[PDB]
A paper describes a structure:
Human NAD-dependent isocitrate dehydrogenase or IDH3 (HsIDH3) catalyzes the decarboxylation of isocitrate into α-ketoglutarate in the tricarboxylic acid cycle. It consists of three types of subunits (α, β, and γ) and exists and functions as the (αβαγ)2 heterooctamer. HsIDH3 is regulated allosterically and/or competitively by numerous metabolites including CIT, ADP, ATP, and NADH. In this work, we report the crystal structures of the αβ and αγ heterodimers and the (αβαγ)2 heterooctamer containing an α-Q139A mutation in the clasp domain, which renders all the heterodimers and the heterooctamer constitutively active in the absence of activators.
Thus, we tried to crystallize the (αMβαMγ)2 holoenzyme in the absence of activators and finally were able to solve the crystal structure of the mutant holoenzyme with an active conformation at 4.5 Å resolution. The structure of the (αMβαMγ)2 holoenzyme belongs to space group C2221 and each asymmetric unit contains two (αMβαMγ)2 heterooctamers. The overall structure of the (αMβαMγ)2 holoenzyme is similar to that of the WT (αβαγ)2 holoenzyme. Intriguingly, when one heterotetramer of the two structures is superposed, the other heterotetramer of the mutant holoenzyme shows approximately 20° rotation relative to that of the WT holoenzyme. Moreover, in the mutant (αMβαMγ)2 structure, the active site and the allosteric site of the αγ heterodimer, the active site and the pseudo-allosteric site of the αβ heterodimer, and the αβ-αγ interface appear to assume active conformations. In particular, the N-terminal regions of the α7 helices in all of the α, β, and γ subunits assume helical conformations similar to that in the active αMgγMg+CIT structure. In addition, the sidechains of Tyr126A and Tyr137B in the αMβ heterodimer adopt active conformations; and while the sidechain of Tyr136G in the αMγ heterodimer is not clearly defined in the electron density map, the sidechain of Tyr126A also adopts active conformation. In other words, the α-Q139A mutation induces conformational changes of the clasp domains of the α subunits and the αβ-αγ interface and subsequently the active sites, the allosteric sites, and the pseudo-allosteric sites, which mimic the conformational changes induced by the binding of activators at the allosteric site, rendering the mutant holoenzyme to adopt the active conformation. Nevertheless, as the resolution of the (αMβαMγ)2 structure is low, we could not perform detailed structural analysis of the αβ-αγ interface and compare it with that in the inactive WT (αβαγ)2 structure. Moreover, the size-exclusion chromatography–multiangle light scattering (SEC-MALS) analysis shows that similar to the WT holoenzyme, the mutant holoenzyme displays an average mass of approximately 290 kDa at both low concentration (1 mg/ml) and high concentration (10 mg/ml) corresponding to an (αMβαMγ)2 heterooctamer.
Author numbering:
A (entry chain G): 4 to 45, 51 to 74, 81 to 338
B (entry chain H): 4 to 348, 350 to 351
C (entry chain F): 15 to 349
D (entry chain E): 3 to 338
Write the structure that this text describes.
């Protein structure tokens, strides 16, 4: 038995968070949940939310409405990695059918320091900050996720030919970890090369690491091949073993209290969360059960979209998860 | 300065042309041959460009471009960077020419089947102020600062170009691309730069969009886009992606405009140094570059009869080049387009 | 006719009081519109300029003391004092450094001038953190305003009939920074041939000011070099307060004390010397087309200092400020 | 018993008065070795950026060195000599004291000031950046360590030289973040050094009061740019750069003692120069090493020759020669 800090959130957030705790009860998931809210106060977070994760080290997060809350949890535990595994979904028909790639998105440094400077009356300068530190760390974490997930090839997206000092140092430490971890295959490829190759044949890709700016854009892009943020898992990792497994889609307030949602992403954020703590067997019975419910093509919800209610899509998974 | 007027002596406009490195020359000769069969009153001023002596001679090679306000070029291999001091051969030209706007035209091809169909997009971006910042000093070791720059002035000049493009062409939607949600001031400046001109063309609907969701929106329903515009940093993304949607680098015409000067370049900047004189290279982009080069000389009648041809030859499966998934050779394509090219208006 | 007085902080108000009485004792027809204050204890005007500008938009002339600066206690993205200067475009700052017959410092019979930029330069409050304990600041210096202060430096030499200017610089390490500035000087200096011109390193210039300052007549420099050499020349004469100051933005004219304040005394006990503002306010009336009152006030202040009878702790004596202000109005009465 | 010092006689009058100093040292029975080296900037594996190694390993062992004046650069591209000396030896602390001279008619008396100047992180670092056309921006950076570093040294000097107070010079009111973090560490050092009084005056305010009355100060501390100008400022009170000594402290016990005055090639080798400026930098070396008994003797006879006024160099207005000046000081350090 293990405890997880959970948060309901806005919109369908609570309506889908309980659809997960009901299927994890049906999956025999050794999880006792722990419900905290996190609404911004004063700036910082609720202290009863601040404590809840300092002990649990894991957490499932949902849709949040509108400084940013995603910036707060970032620096609250020094979230230094935004991970996003995008995988093809048989049944869900998208013109990209053979996809299986995990975007690693460094989340600390880059131009996301917000540091801008008016220089004269009409000249604005935004700062891109890059340290050796946050690079070598997102370099080791990438190799540890590749090893601990049977991943074949790890590519470091960059434009070091251009920013010969900025992206060059990023790449310099990308290689230094590769010799000290020749375990997994390692190669490089220019951003624009990846951007073209991504829309021609994504299959040739496997694992990708990049600095923050390229990461935020590549993350939502790679997801766009499979269907959108509603089917996209998401996992942020921070210092001292803390980890967050959010969804990324919008709150969708127009049908929040309607049971007209698709939570599967939040589930695969938990199936991701399951797989982070070594729950392969219990994440293998949940993941393939949700795959088969969509692959059957009967209980899909409206943004997919068939004709059912979020509970029906939730009830069929509970019927297909009670079996092995 | 001492600059004269570019003039057109009795018919033939005199256009500057640069062969380049790799695939450049072997294509240009077909573009010549295509024209020469099409009886196009455009004479060509060859100028050997670079990778042979990129020191001071090319510069005497700038002059020909500064003369005739319109040039067409292939590509130049990147400098070894041994100098490692800017010196982008291609870039230098667009600097000393004040070529601020960079324009590509990703259109779907009825003969080139892709994951998505019915696509028509015009992309706009700057060059010397659209971020893409150099500089990057090391404050202390292990710490590097990069300095993306927005200028309000060049932001409106590229903005006005985005809308002067839409009205003359009968477009309907300009869509800004930005990350103002992260760099509130830099990209918000560009955003309010767009909003100012957006009110001067009220007939043209205006919309903004975050660079993130915009990329997602392309691979799903790209037909919604009509005209897109961003600073030069986000372009490399949107360009190469919109390039691969309708095919590959060898299918996208390109163009770098100045306040007066106008240069035509391919949508994809690929040297092709590995496909040297293989009779393989896809011409369909380079040809399309000549198409809009004729459209800029206000000779549409020939750019239209050329354009309908190259779409025409491409639709038969056999003419595709290897780089897009075919089995044919350029010589067959060029001639098949020439076949497709009938004697409109000659003998 | 109508003028706005911004006392600022320090003894500035105590000094404004001395002028108000000296004005009422010299039949000076200026209805002061001094209204409260700008920042400091008051806090941000804010937009004091809005309050401030509207008065300047109408009066077109004013006179303040010194803000004296806050040392970043507040949010303080940038120093407030520059911003009013920016909102009013007071790009030029003029410091009359004229040794006086009464005061006998270690250097006598001197008559120079400090021309100073106030908008470009490091006085922008621009900074940020790169890492843990690694801060980075930006000196801004652009061609547009560098010309205007370079332009400002030279037309001053013609209308007053001066001899030579000397552009101050440390471009030998900031090749791009003071090099751009120094070029805009040598660019303009070509246009003024009847004017001898020099360039001098800052540290080398400052050391010559303490060896032989009689060598150079007019000086022009960016913002940081200004505030440095400002308090230097004023200190050499005797006190920051005795030397006055002038700052012209657009068509507006602004006068104030030369130096920021006599820092060491830091006194509100009325011990402070008002000569500075008075000489600046006199030079103000000289601008107000009322040269008589400007001339007669300067005459009385000079001779009174030349009397050696009435002096304050800065000038070797011990007199109250309103004692001196009264003897000022005393020699003003008989004249 | 004896010690080694790497001597760099330099250009112009330098070697002439460098041997004049080596004579007065033997005339006062000074146990010091002289390892003559030239240090002219040699070209490295790509440009112009390294030194004669023969002078390097000497300093890496001698730890102490005396440098005289040096000339300009052969081409515009060549870098400043004292910059590589800074970066090749980590000379963070830049020392320049100023004491009034009893036999000099300067209109400033009874001063005894020492400047502590920061030497690497700062405006002097070559980083600048052009933004757009006609828009130039310089780079000033300050770090926690080197600020804490220049701090912990300056307090030790006052602890080591029987000094009383210490003033921190800055303009943190205006460049709040930079000078402030400099200042917040300046404060944090006096917290463990309560034996030395400490205060802070604004830089513009220091200049003003430094002009009127200078004696109201002891030792001063500031970052690099303020130093290189306030040091030259304070130099004028002590007779200028030519008659004022200097010091540079590198890591691993490496120290450097130099004069800042020019090399003077329009009077070079004519036996006219005034060696007293660098001669005192040698005395600063004797003070940092430990020969105060030998340092107090020379600084006394050095003052006595100037105080008598019988012999003076032409830069001091006199009609005596460098040899006439060196010999009267030599015959004085003997009478002790």
């Amino acid at each position: 038995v293990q405890t997880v800090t959970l948060i309901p959130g806005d919109g369908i957030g609570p309506e889908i968070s309980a659809a997960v705790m009901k299927i994890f009860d049906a999956a025999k998931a050794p999880i006792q949940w722990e419900e905290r809210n996190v609404t911004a106060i004063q700036w910082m977070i609720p202290s009863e939310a601040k404590e809840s994760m300092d002990k649990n080290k894991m957490g499932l997060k949902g849709p949040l409405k509108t400084p940013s809350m995603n910036l707060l949890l970032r620096k609250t535990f020094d979230l230094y990695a935004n991970v996003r595994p995008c995988v093809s979904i048989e049944g869900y028909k998208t013109p990209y059918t053979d996809v299986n790639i995990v975007t690693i998105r460094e989340n600390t440094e880059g131009e996301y320091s917000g540091i801008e400077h008016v220089i004269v009356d009409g000249v604005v300068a935004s700062i891109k900050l890059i340290t050796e530190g946050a690079s070598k760390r997102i370099a080791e974490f990438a190799f540890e996720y590749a090893r601990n997930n049977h991943r074949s090839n790890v590519t470091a997206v960059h434009k070091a030919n251009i920013m010969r000092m900025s992206d060059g140092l990023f790449l310099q430490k990308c290689r230094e970890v590769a010799e000290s971890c020749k375990d997994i295959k390692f190669n490089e490829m220019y951003l624009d090369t990846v951007c073209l190759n991504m829309v021609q044949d994504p299959s040739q890709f496997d694992v990708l690491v990049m600095p923050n700016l390229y990461g935020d854009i590549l993350s939502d892009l790679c997801a766009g091949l499979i269907g959108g943020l509603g089917v996209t898992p998401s996992g942020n990792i921070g210092a001292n073993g803390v980890a967050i497994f959010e969804s990324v889609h919008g709150t969708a307030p127009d049908i929040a209290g309607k049971d007209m949602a698709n939570p599967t992403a939040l589930l695969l954020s938990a199936v991701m969360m399951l797989r982070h703590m070594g729950l392969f067997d219990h994440a293998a019975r949940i993941e393939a059960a949700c795959f088969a419910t969509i692959k059957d093509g009967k209980s899909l919800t409206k943004d997919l979209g068939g004709n059912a209610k979020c509970s029906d899509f939730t009830e069929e998974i509970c019927r297909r998860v009670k079996d092995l | 300065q001492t600059i004269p007027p570019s003039a057109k002596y009795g018919g033939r406009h005199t256009v500057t042309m640069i062969p380049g490195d790799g695939i450049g020359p072997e294509l240009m000769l077909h573009v010549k041959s295509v024209f020469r069969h099409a009886c196009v009153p455009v004479d060509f001023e060859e100028v050997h460009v670079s990778s042979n002596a990129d020191e001071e001679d090319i510069r005497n090679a700038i002059m020909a471009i500064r003369r005739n306000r319109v040039a067409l070029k292939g590509n130049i291999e990147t400098n070894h960077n041994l100098p490692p001091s800017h010196k982008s051969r291609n870039n230098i030209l667009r600097t000393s020419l004040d070529l601020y706007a960079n324009v590509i035209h990703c259109k779907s091809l009825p003969g080139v089947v892709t994951r998505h169909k019915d696509i028509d997009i015009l992309i706009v971006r700057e060059n010397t102020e659209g971020e893409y910042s150099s500089l990057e000093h090391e404050s202390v070791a292990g710490v590097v600062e990069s300095l993306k720059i927005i200028t309000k002035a060049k932001s409106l000049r590229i903005a006005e170009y985005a809308f002067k493009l839409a009205q003359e062409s009968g477009r309907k939607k300009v869509t800004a691309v930005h990350k103002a949600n992260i760099m509130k001031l830099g990209d918000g400046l560009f955003l309010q730069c767009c909003r100012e001109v957006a009110a001067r063309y009220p007939q043209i609907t205006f919309e903004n969009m975050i660079v993130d969701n915009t990329t997602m929106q392309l691979v799903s329903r790209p037909q919604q886009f009509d005209v897109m515009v961003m600073p030069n940093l986000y372009g490399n993304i949107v360009n190469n992606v919109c390039a691969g949607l309708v095919g590959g680098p060898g299918l996208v015409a390109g163009a770098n405009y100045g306040h007066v000067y106008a240069v035509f370049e391919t949508a994809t900047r690929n040297t092709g140094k590995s496909i040297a004189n293989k009779n393989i290279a896809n011409p369909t982009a380079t040809l399309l570059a000549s198409c809009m080069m004729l459209d800029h000389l206000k000779l549409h009648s020939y750019a239209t009869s050329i354009r309908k041809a190259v779409l025409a030859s491409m639709d038969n499966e056999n003419m595709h080049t290897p780089d897009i998934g075919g089995q044919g050779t350029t010589s067959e394509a060029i001639q098949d387009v020439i076949r497709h090219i009938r004697v409109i208006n000659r003998a | 006719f109508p003028v706005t007085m911004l006392p600022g902080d320090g003894v500035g108000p105590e000094l404004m009081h001395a002028v108000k009485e000296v004005f009422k004792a010299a039949a000076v027809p200026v209805e002061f519109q001094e209204h409260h204050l700008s920042e400091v204890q008051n806090m941000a005007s804010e937009e004091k300029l809005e309050q401030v500008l509207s008065s300047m938009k109408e009066n077109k002339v004013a006179i303040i003391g010194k803000i004296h600066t806050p040392m970043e206690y507040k949010g303080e993205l940038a120093s407030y004092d520059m911003r009013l200067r920016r909102k009013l475009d007071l790009f030029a700052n003029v410091v009359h450094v004229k040794s006086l017959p009464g005061y006998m410092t270690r250097h006598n019979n001197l008559d120079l001038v400090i021309i100073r930029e106030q908008t470009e330069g490091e006085y922008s409050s621009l900074e940020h953190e790169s890492a843990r304990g690694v801060i980075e600041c930006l000196k801004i210096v652009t061609r547009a305003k560098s010309q205007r202060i370079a332009k400002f430096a030279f037309d001053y030499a013609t209308k007053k009939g001066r001899g030579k200017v000397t552009a101050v610089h440390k471009a030998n390490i900031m090749k791009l920074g003071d090099g751009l500035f120094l070029q805009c000087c040598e660019e303009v200096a070509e246009l003024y041939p009847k004017i001898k011109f020099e360039t001098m390193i800052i540290d080398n210039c400052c050391m010559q000011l303490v060896q032989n300052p009689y060598q150079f007549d007019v000086l022009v420099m960016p913002n940081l070099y200004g505030n440095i050499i400002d308090n230097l020349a004023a200190g050499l004469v005797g006190g920051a307060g005795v030397v006055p100051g002038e700052s012209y933005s657009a068509e507006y004219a602004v006068f104030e004390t030369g130096a920021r304040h006599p820092f060491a005394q830091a006194v509100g006990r009325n011990i402070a010397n008002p000569t500075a503002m008075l000489l600046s306010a006199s030079n103000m009336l000289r601008h107000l087309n009322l040269e008589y009152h400007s001339s007669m006030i300067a005459d009385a202040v000079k001779k009174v200092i030349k009397v050696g009878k009435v002096r304050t702790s800065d000038m070797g004596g011990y007199a109250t400020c309103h004692d001196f202000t009264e003897e000022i109005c005393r020699r003003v009465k008989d004249l």
